[PDB]
Design a protein around this ligand. Structure first.
Ligand SMILES: Oc1c(Br)cc(CCc2c(Cl)cccc2Cl)cc1Br
Ligand SMILES: Oc1c(Br)cc(CCc2c(Cl)cccc2Cl)cc1Br
Lengths: 114, 114, 115, 115
């Protein structure tokens, strides 16, 4: 139900071995860890959660872009990229969070399908 | 060797049934038709060409964004989106041209892999 | 030294009346309020801070995109757009944080200059 | 009535000295030269045309991104960034065409205002 895909706008490639952390907003407004992993050779991260676990709520996907750029020897602007959204059962069942990274910029979209 | 993928930033969905035309630049600097198709339910267009046909050269991928927006009842800015690039045998063998569409904006990247 | 500019990719316009909150990470690792404001008719937000006050640190610029889209009667995907960066770590710089908004997407870039 | 602004997503800066060519589609469907120029130190290009000359039509703004990246010693993917649009079809408007460049990617948006 929740996939992440990360691309590199400098190399023209998937962004490989990027750390990704997902958090769920708790009742006291703190961010509780929920799932995490590293993107694969295709820039994708699957298997974060399951339909049972992924209930409605506010989630934050933190992509560790700074470490990615540093591993390539490139000087970056951002500490990380953030994607904060509400999971909604009224819409389609599968969320893909896609991000496109540059040293001083990032873009993100949601692809929400059944 | 050449895939196109198109996403919709308004609906948060693949951009389905978008017409895509690929042209190759000819010796007299005109654009000759090369391949075309329409994106699938996943927003993807496969099977445009083959490794034998897809020789080095300058190619233009024209995505008919205006008709896409009009079919959804949305008033667009651009006539089409353009992606013009040189195919290079020194780099990886597979090109994916990805585009993310909004009514007054578009973004595109290349994902070039082996 | 810290300005924000926000554009609307649906309308082809500045994104007017967008709330922006800036935080700075404190020594205890919490996010301290730093400055806030709203974009103008030009999509710009000036006057958040001063060179004196804008010291080195890790800053988070939170752009309230959901509130923007909801005020236009649209149900968007994201809660906000966040831009988190270390500022002034090799002396003072001037930063422009630009964002381009759509209901299910946003993009951001920084323009950093040395006065 | 027609301005261009170009930013560099690698440097976090304006994209300076970027060549821009504007064409207009003619009655025979060819692309006629219309105006050209280069971005300044601020990444901006003003003075391309005049309200008199900028009549209704289909315009193509070609941003010479490959030449930019090559001048910086970088081998980029795209030949150029193209922005093709119908202008002034419900009377005069003022257009800003903005682009954000990376070696394998670009994004563009339009800001359209009614004077
Ligand atoms: O499989 C996919 C999926 Br799903 C999504 C994208 C979109 C990447 C993108 C972003 Cl994230 C922001 C601006 C422009 C772009 Cl082209 C690409 C591929 Br290939
Ligand atoms: O005055 C400005 C400033 Br300063 C910045 C931009 C960049 C807008 C943008 C973003 Cl933020 C992300 C992807 C693509 C784009 Cl064209 C435009 C203008 Br006009």
């Amino acid at each position: 139900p929740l996939m992440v895909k990360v691309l590199d706008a400098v190399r023209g490639s998937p962004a490989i071995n990027v750390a990704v952390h997902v958090f769920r907003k708790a009742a006291d407004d703190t961010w509780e860890p929920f799932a995490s992993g590293k993107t694969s050779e295709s820039g994708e991260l699957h298997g974060l959660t399951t339909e049972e676990e992924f209930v409605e709520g506010i989630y934050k996907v933190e992509i560790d872009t700074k470490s990615y750029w540093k591993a390539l020897g490139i000087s970056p602007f951002h500490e990380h990229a953030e994607v904060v959204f509400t999971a909604n059962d009224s819409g389609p069942r599968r969320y893909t969070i896609a991000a496109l990274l540059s040293p001083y910029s990032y873009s993100t979209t949601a692809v929400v399908t059944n």
